[PDB]
Design a protein around this ligand. Structure first.
Ligand SMILES: Nc1ncnc2c1ncn2[C@@H]1O[C@H](CSCC[C@H](N)C(=O)O)[C@@H](O)[C@H]1O
Ligand SMILES: Cn1c(=O)[nH]c2nncnc2c1=O
Length: 243
C-alpha cells in the first residue's frame, strides 16, 4: 500500500490556509455534523487531523483518525502533541480495514474520491456502516458526480485539475494543489448511480446530497464573477448517510 500524500505532507496544510474553497467546505461540513458534545467520532482520511481535532475542540468525547499515509499520520500525531489533545491515529487503507470500534459519527472529508475502483468504493461504504452505531450517521465530502472539466477548471479556488480521463465506469482526474511548488495528486469521479448503489448495498437506508454553502460574505470578498465556476460546475458535494 502506497500513499501519494507521503510526498505532499505539510504542503497540504499550506493549501488549506490559502485555498478560497476551503472555508466553504469547512462551513458545509460542520453544518452537516451539528453538535458533537459527548459523541464518539471516527475521522476517515483524516490528513493532519483537521476535522477530528476541531470536532474534539467542539466537545467530542473520543476521536480516532485514520489515514493511509504514514507521513500524514506523523503530522497528525505531531499536532496532537503540540496541543495536548486526546486524538489517536491509525495508518490504514480504509477500503481494506477492519472495524476499530462503534462510533456515533463517522466523518469522511475527501475519502471516497480516492477509491480507485467501484469495488473499492463499495468496500469503503461497508467499512463505514460497520463502524457506526445504529443511531449514528456518516458525514462525507467528495467529488460531485456532475463535475465536468469542460465546464471550467478550479485552479483559482485552489485545485488545478489537469485532465479528465476514463477510468472503468468513472473518470480519473490528475490535479495539483495550488501551493509553491504545486503538489500533484489524483482522484476519481464515480457516478451518482454508483455512489447510491454503494450506499444502499452497505446498509444505509437514508442519504442526502448537500450542495456547498456559499455565503454573501464569500461573494463580497472576491471580484465579480469569481465564484461562477464554483457554483455552476461544482467540483465538491457533501453527503450524509444514516443506517
Ligand atoms: N484509501 C484511503 N484510506 C485512507 N486514507 C486515504 C485513502 N486514500 C487517500 N487517503 C487520505 O485522504 C487524505 C485526503 S486530504 C483530506 C485530509 C482531511 N480529511 C482534511 O480535509 O483536512 C490524504 O491525507 C490521503 O492520504
Ligand atoms: C477534488 N478535491 C478537492 O477539490 N479538494 C480537495 N481537498 N483536499 C483533498 N482532496 C481534495 C480533492 O480531491
Amino acid at each position: 500500500t502506497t500513499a501519494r500524500y507521503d510526498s505532499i505532507g505539510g504542503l497540504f496544510e499550506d493549501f488549506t490556509q490559502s485555498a478560497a474553497q476551503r472555508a466553504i467546505e469547512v462551513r458545509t461540513i460542520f453544518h452537516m455534523i451539528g453538535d458533537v458534545s459527548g459523541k464518539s467520532v471516527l475521522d476517515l482520511a483524516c490528513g493532519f487531523g483537521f476535522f477530528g481535532r476541531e470536532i474534539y475542540r467542539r466537545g467530542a468525547a473520543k476521536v480516532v483518525g485514520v489515514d493511509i499515509s504514514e507521513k500524514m499520520i506523523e503530522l497528525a500525531r505531531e499536532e496532537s502533541r503540540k496541543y495536548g489533545d486526546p486524538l489517536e491515529f491509525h495508518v490504514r487503507d480504509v477500503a481494506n480495514m477492519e472495524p476499530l470500534g462503534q462510533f456515533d459519527l463517522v466523518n469522511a472529508a475527501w475519502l471516497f474520491n480516492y477509491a480507485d475502483s467501484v469495488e473499492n468504493l463499495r468496500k469503503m461504504f461497508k467499512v463505514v456502516r460497520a463502524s457506526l452505531k445504529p443511531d449514528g450517521k456518516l458525514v462525507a465530502y467528495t467529488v460531485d458526480p456532475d463535475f465536468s472539466l469542460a465546464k471550467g477548471n478550479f485552479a483559482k479556488y485552489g485545485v488545478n485539475v489537469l485532465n479528465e480521463r476514463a477510468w472503468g465506469p468513472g473518470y480519473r482526474h490528475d490535479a495539483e494543489f495550488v501551493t509553491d511548488p504545486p503538489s500533484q495528486f489524483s482522484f476519481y469521479r464515480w457516478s451518482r448511480a454508483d455512489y447510491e448503489s454503494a450506499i444502499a448495498d452497505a446498509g444505509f437506508s437514508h442519504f442526502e446530497w448537500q450542495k456547498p454553502l456559499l455565503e454573501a460574505d464569500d461573494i463580497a470578498t472576491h471580484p465579480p464573477g469569481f465564484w461562477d465556476v464554483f457554483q455552476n460546475n461544482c467540483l465538491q458535494t457533501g453527503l450524509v448517510c444514516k443506517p
